[PDB]
């Protein structure tokens, strides 16, 4: 989130980068096929 919203925390990716502590881990997106394409903001655009 923007960090001006109440309760904002960084996106999932930053947590994985924080966790693996290397710049080049092996991210594994799982189960891409059934991603939720709704009116509330389609993540599938975000993946591009």
């Amino acid at each position: 989130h923007r960090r001006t919203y109440v309760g904002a925390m960084p996106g999932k990716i930053i947590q994985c980068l924080k966790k693996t502590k290397t710049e080049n881990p092996l991210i594994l997106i799982d189960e891409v096929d059934k991603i939720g394409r709704g009116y509330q903001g389609d993540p599938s655009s975000a993946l591009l």
């Binding site: 903001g41 389609d42 655009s45 591009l48």
Partner: protein, 49 residues
Amino acid sequence: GSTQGKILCFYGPPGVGKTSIARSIARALNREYFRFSVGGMTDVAEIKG
């Protein structure tokens, strides 16, 4: 005299090389480049905040 703007459109079978010419022109004239996909959008706020 001065610099001037203009709009243009390209069309043809996918993968003919369109975008590649875009960037090549951008380095030809020396103007700055910026891609902006808008496929499938409905959020006018994306165009206006």
